[PDB]
Amino acid sequence: LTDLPGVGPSTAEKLVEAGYIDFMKIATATVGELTDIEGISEKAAAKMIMGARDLCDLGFKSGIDLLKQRSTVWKLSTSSSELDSVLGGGLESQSVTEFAGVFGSGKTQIMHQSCVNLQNPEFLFYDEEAVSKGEVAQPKAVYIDTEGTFRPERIMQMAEHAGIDGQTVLDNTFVARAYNSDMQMLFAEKIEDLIQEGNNIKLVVIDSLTSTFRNEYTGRGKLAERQQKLGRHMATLNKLADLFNCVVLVTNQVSGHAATFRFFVRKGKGDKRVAKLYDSPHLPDAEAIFRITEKGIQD
Numbered sequence: 493l494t495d496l497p498g499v500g501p502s503t504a505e506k507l508v509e510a511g512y513i514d515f516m517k518i519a520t521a522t523v524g525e526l527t528d529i530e531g532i533s534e535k536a537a538a539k540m541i542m543g544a545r546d547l548c549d550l551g552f553k554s555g556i557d558l559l560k561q562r563s564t565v566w567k568l569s570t571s572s573s574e575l576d577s578v579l580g581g582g583l584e585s586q587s588v589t590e591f592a593g594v595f596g597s598g599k600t601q602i603m604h605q606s607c608v609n610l611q612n613p614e615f616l617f618y619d620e621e622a623v624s625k626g627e628v629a630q631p632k633a634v635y636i637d638t639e640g641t642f643r644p645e646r647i648m649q650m651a652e653h654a655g656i657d658g659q660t661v662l663d664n665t666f667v668a669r670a671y672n673s674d675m676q677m678l679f680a681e682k683i684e685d686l687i688q689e690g691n692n693i694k695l696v697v698i699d700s701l702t703s704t705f706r707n708e709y710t711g712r713g714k715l716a717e718r719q720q721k722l723g724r725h726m727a728t729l730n731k732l733a734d735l736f737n738c739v740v741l742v743t744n745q746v747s748g749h750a751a752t753f754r755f756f757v758r759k760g761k762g763d764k765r766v767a768k769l770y771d772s773p774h775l776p777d778a779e780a781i782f783r784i785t786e787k788g789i790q791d
């Protein structure tokens with residue numbers, strides 16, 4: 493931290509204590525967040541912010557540097573060939589992907605499968621030139637369970653069928669049971685702490701994203717307040733995805749969100765499932781057919 497312009501030993505101590513230990517967090521911080529630290533003037537705040545941005549080279553970029561930036565994005569396999577393809581490779585880090593659908597369509601299944609695949613190193617697709625092995629080593633997932641449907645037995649089962657130790661997935665997956673939107677949101681904000689503690693969080697799951705908000709703000713005469721809270725939550729999720737080069741997945745029960753990728757999943761004939769990608773910044777709307785078996789997501 494003392495590398496930052498104006499930052500001396502005492503200021504560094506105040507920053508680390510306030511949770512600002514990383515440069516990108518300071519570079520992307522507002523003078524407000526830092527002046528709130530007290531002891532941190534708006535003067536020092538502005539200088540260290542400018543210096544962090546510069547140290548992180550956050551200016552204008554063009555040409556080949558645009559490709560290099562896009563290359564820091566790694567993708568997580570869904571275990572479904574059709575789905576991975578419709579995704580343009582797999583689930584993207586640095587973005588929030590939403591899986592919406594009626595009850596029983598398979599949203600929770602995809603969340604579980606994703607926690608398992610994170611542990612199969614060959615399921616993380618990346619350009620070693622832009623993403624080092626160290627960056628994706630010992631990856632851990634965070635599962636914010638809003639419904640109480642997290643099933644450790646299901647994790648074990650999927651893991652085993654994929655040839656991976658079930659307990660190893662459990663050992664590297666943090667589950668947080670949230671009973672309301674307040675807990676749901678705090679948990680997500682506290683993910684930054686798991687990382688500061690040495691945990692390489694590479695996958696964040698929110699299952700589900702909207703249940704709590706809907707039960708708390710049913711009155712469609714306050715839907716604005718709800719939308720406001722949900723908006724702040726989503727913003728926290730997108731920033732988390734970006735700053736920590738992390739894959740973020742959310743589910744939504746249906747009978748629009750700030751998610752960069754949005755799917756509609758419906759149950760097909762028996763085993764079959766159809767995921768329709770209807771929203772993304774660079775992919776065409778397309779459907780992927782797959783199935784859910786005792787092995788998890790397959791085909």
Ligand SMILES: Nc1ncnc2c1ncn2[C@@H]1O[C@H](COP(=O)(O)OP(=O)(O)O)[C@@H](O)[C@H]1O
Nearest residue numbers: 593594595596597598599600601602784785786
């Ligand atoms: N162990 C299993 N073996 C085969 N299919 C399973 C297994 N566990 C769950 N499923 C399938 O997952 C479906 C439920 O998926 P789920 O993700 O919970 O739906 P939702 O979108 O409401 O969260 C079941 O109804 C069942 O067909």
Ligand SMILES: [K+]
Nearest residue numbers: 494496498499
């Ligand atoms: K300094």
Ligand SMILES: [Mg+2]
Nearest residue numbers: 586587733734
């Ligand atoms: Mg992003």
Ligand SMILES: [Mg+2]
Nearest residue numbers: 599600639641
């Ligand atoms: Mg579910």
